[PDB]
C-alpha cells in the first residue's frame, strides 16, 4: 500500500476539493470524493487518490465507483474497499457483448 496522493487518505479532505465542480452534473461531490476522487478544478476532471487515474467526460448515468472499476481496474484503492468480486461483475458486463454477437 502506498497512496498516489497521501494527503487524501482522508475523504473529508477530498470533499473539500469540489467547489468549482459544476453542481449541475449528476455526479455529486460526496460520491466522487468518496469513490476516491477529488476535483482537479477544470470542467468535470477528477482524479483518483490511490492510483491517480484521471477521468473526465461524465454522463448522467456514470457512477463513480462503477467507472472507477471499468477503466482503472488495477486500483489498490477500489480493489480494497469494494473487493475484487465487485470489480469482476463490473467488467463481466460485457454479458451483453456475447448477447449481441
Amino acid at each position: 500500500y502506498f497512496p498516489q496522493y497521501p494527503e487524501y487518505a482522508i475523504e473529508t479532505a477530498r470533499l473539500r476539493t469540489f467547489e468549482a465542480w459544476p453542481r449541475n452534473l449528476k455526479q455529486k461531490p460526496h460520491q466522487l470524493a468518496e469513490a476516491g476522487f477529488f476535483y482537479t478544478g477544470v470542467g468535470d476532471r477528477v482524479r483518483c487518490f490511490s492510483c491517480g487515474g484521471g477521468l473526465m467526460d461524465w454522463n448522467d448515468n456514470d457512477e463513480p465507483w462503477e467507472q472507477h472499476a471499468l477503466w482503472l481496474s488495477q486500483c489498490r484503492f477500489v480493489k480494497l474497499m469494494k473487493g475484487q468480486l465487485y470489480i469482476d461483475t463490473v467488467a463481466a458486463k460485457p454479458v451483453l457483448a456475447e448477447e449481441k454477437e
Binding site: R45, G54, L55, M56, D57, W58, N59, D62, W71
Partner: peptide, 7 residues
C-alpha cells in the same frame, strides 16, 4: 498528465 475519459 492525461485524462482517461470514462464515457
Amino acid at each position: 498528465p492525461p485524462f482517461i475519459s470514462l464515457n
